[PDB]
Each structure stands twice: as C-alpha cells, then as structure tokens.
Design a protein around this ligand. Structure first.
Ligand SMILES: CC[C@H](Cc1ccccc1)[C@@H]1/C=C/C/C=C/C[C@@H](C)[C@H](O)[C@@H](C)[C@@H]2CC[C@@H](C)[C@@](O)(O2)C(=O)C(=O)N2CCCC[C@H]2C(=O)O1
Ligand SMILES: CC[C@H](Cc1ccccc1)[C@@H]1/C=C/C/C=C/C[C@@H](C)[C@H](O)[C@@H](C)[C@@H]2CC[C@@H](C)[C@@](O)(O2)C(=O)C(=O)N2CCCC[C@H]2C(=O)O1
Ligand SMILES: [Mg+2]
Lengths: 83, 107, 83, 108
C-alpha cells in the first residue's frame, strides 16, 4: 500500500544523483583538458629555455674568441709603443 | 609575412637601427583576440637588440618599421612566427598571431 | 514479493551511482589542485625564460662593445705602424 | 653552506674543465627527499654550458669544476648556492637543498 510511494521517491533520488554524477564528471573532464594544455605549456616553455641557453652558450663561445683576440691585439699595441 | 597598422602615431623620425636595443610593451593574441602573453600584465617592458635574431622574423621586420612612441598592430603569418609546429599549450600549428606593440624607447 | 526486487534494484543503483559521483568529485578537486600547481610552474619558467633572454641581450651588447674596442685597438696599432 | 661532491663513478682523473670550455653533461635534479624536478636523461639530450661565464648556479660552477671527464658525481647544494629563500614556485620550494646526479660526458 505505502510501499508504492517510497519506490517512486527513491527513483527521483536516483535521478537527482545521476544528474550530480554528470555535473562532477563534466567538471572533471573540463579540468583534465585545462591541465593537459597547461602541462603542454610547461614542456614548451622548458624547450624555449633550452633554446635561450643554447643561445647564451653560442654568445659566450664567440665572446671567448673576441676576448682572446682583443688581449693579443692589446699586447701587440704595447709592444709597438715601446719600440 | 607581417602587416604593420598604426594604433597611435610615434614621432615619425626615430626608427631603430641594427645593434640598437628596442624597449617595448606588448600584448600577444591569436587571430580571435585571445591573449596568450603580455608584458603589461607583468609591468615589465620587454627588451631585445634589433638584427641579432633574438626574436621572430615578424618582429624583426615589424618593429624596425616603427618610430619611438608608436603603438602598432603587427599581424604575423605563421611562416614569420611559429610555422607548422607552433608551441603546444600556447600557440597552435599554422597560427596567425596579432601583437599590439608600443616602442617606448631605444638604448 | 513484487516490490522487494525493485527496492533491492533501486538500492543497488543508488549506491553505485553515489560512489561514482564521489569519485568524480574527488577527481575534479585533485585536478583543480594539480592545475593551480602546474600554473605556478608555468609562471616560474616564464620568469626563467625572461632572465635567459636578458642574458642573451647582455651578451649581444657586450659583443658589440668588445668588437668596437677591438676595432679602436686595431686602428691605434695601424697608426703606430705608420706614424 | 656550499656544495659537496661525492663520486658515484670515477672519471679519467686527468681531464678537468677550464674556464672558457663547454662542459657536456647529463644530470638529474632532485629535492632533498629524492623527488625529481628535472632530467636531461628523460629528454635524451645532454646539457651544455660554458664554465666561468656565470651560466649556472654557483653550486654547479664549483662542483662540476672538480670533476674529470667520465666522472659521475652527486652534488648536494645548499640554498645559498642555489635558489635561496624564493625558490621557483611549483618546482623548487623556499630554502631548498638540491641534489644533482651529474655525469661529465666530454669537453668541447
Ligand atoms: C617561442 C619564443 C621565441 C623564441 C625565438 C627566438 C628567436 C627566433 C625565433 C624564435 C621568442 C623569444 C624571445 C625572447 C624570450 C622572451 C622570454 C619571455 C619574455 C617570453 O614571454 C616567452 C617566455 C614566451 C614564450 C612563448 C611565446 C609565444 C611568447 O609568449 O613568449 C611570446 O609572447 C612571443 O611570441 N614572443 C616574445 C616577445 C617577442 C616576440 C615573440 C618572440 O620572438 O619569442
Ligand atoms: C633557474 C635556472 C638557472 C638560472 C641561472 C642562471 C645563471 C646563474 C644562476 C641561475 C640555471 C639555468 C641554466 C641554463 C638554462 C637551462 C634550461 C633548461 C635546460 C632547464 O631545464 C631549465 C628550464 C630549468 C629551470 C628550473 C631549474 C630548477 C631547472 O629545473 O632548470 C634545473 O634543473 C636547474 O636547476 N639547473 C639547470 C641545469 C644546470 C643546473 C641549474 C641551473 O643553474 O639553472
Ligand atoms: Mg675569456
């Protein structure tokens, strides 16, 4: 008699929970896409940094040769100014 | 290539030469106006030396056409920016970029 | 009975759906926390890149002045070998 | 209060980097508890830097300079020789003592 009523109540409680499950799943799926894109961003910035450091190294290699050539040319100028 | 359109006029006579440091503020956007970077958000003007290939080709060509004080829109096609690869999470493959650039000074 | 089967079926469906909701809720919370942390590492790498570019620029300025000094030293050496 | 160098595998004991030389290395960077924050090995890509050009943290400059070609070593670096009070949010926390597993592959 009264058991027909409670079965309908629990059906409506199940629909409500089913709706909540979907809201949390979708929220989670959206956050998962943001994270993957943000993780991709980290990898790309790392590789940008790797390039910038390779550039610093290339500059310092060139700076090394210029410092040597300047030192020798200064030495030769001092030798000439004596004689 | 790169297209240069004037937002706000500069002095119209002080253009940067190779070996000069350009000091700018910029906002970087995709073609729909979505921002991906900005020196203004950091309150930190960006600096680079013209002609040393420190920046993308579109900037090398675009900024050299600007005079001190000028604010300009640079529309940069992917061959003058990041091409077929882009930068995952930041710049899609084959993206046209829009930069709002202001040339603040030269040093 | 008739309803005891459907009551047992509704109990099982509700608890299974609730458990799934709880897992999605937890996942969404953990992904949000992980996203915030990855976003901080993105900012830090941006600042590392800013520093490395300032280092490139500094090397390029120093190369320019080193080259200029080398040129002045060469002109001076050449003038000593004439005068 | 500096950097400590503990040999994992010995080098040739003869070829030491000079300032101005490019060091080619592999490294794994870890926090004091052993949590990995970076690795050139995971990238399959040796890391390069020139010694004596202020390109790396002081703990590296001092530690790698003590290594010979072929040597693998553990560098334990105090915060003052690394990233200090500030660290790098999301990667290196405040006042982090760092441990680098470093191998000197060659000089160029
Ligand atoms: C991918 C960075 C790229 C590397 C490169 C250098 C030389 C030639 C070709 C490429 C080069 C780098 C230069 C020097 C380093 C600057 C470091 C800090 C200030 C930047 O915020 C970096 C971390 C990000 C990386 C991702 C980029 C999409 C972009 O967001 O810069 C960006 O706005 C951009 O597209 N920028 C930054 C502002 C100037 C225009 C353009 C550029 O040329 O970038
Ligand atoms: C914060 C990076 C720091 C900046 C700096 C430069 C000169 C003097 C003082 C500091 C300097 C930079 C060097 C040259 C750039 C190299 C670029 C690529 C290979 C690195 O993966 C960068 C993107 C990350 C940044 C965050 C760091 C926590 C660490 O994960 O490197 C790292 O492992 C480290 O602690 N590294 C990297 C390998 C050598 C040891 C040490 C270091 O000295 O780094
Ligand atoms: Mg030197």
């Amino acid at each position: 008699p009264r058991l027909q009523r409670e079965l309908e109540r629990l059906q409506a409680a199940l629909r409500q929970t089913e709706a909540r499950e979907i809201e949390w799943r979708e929220k989670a799926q959206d956050l998962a896409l943001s994270l993957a894109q943000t993780k991709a961003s980290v990898s790309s910035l790392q590789e940008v940094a790797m390039f910038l450091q390779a550039s610093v190294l290339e500059r310092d290699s060139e700076q090394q040769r210029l410092q040597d050539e300047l030192e020798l040319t200064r030495r030769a100028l001092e030798k000439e100014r004596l004689h | 290539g790169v297209q240069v359109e004037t937002i706000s006029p500069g002095d119209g006579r002080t253009f940067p030469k190779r070996g000069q440091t350009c000091v700018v503020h910029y906002t970087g956007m995709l073609e729909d106006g979505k921002k991906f970077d900005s020196s203004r958000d950091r309150n930190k003007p960006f600096k680079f030396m013209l002609g040393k290939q420190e920046v993308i080709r579109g900037w090398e060509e675009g900024v050299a056409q600007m005079s001190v004080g000028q604010r300009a829109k640079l529309t940069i096609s992917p061959d003058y920016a990041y091409g077929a690869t882009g930068h995952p999470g930041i710049i899609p493959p084959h993206a046209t970029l829009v930069f709002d650039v202001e040339l603040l000074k030269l040093e």
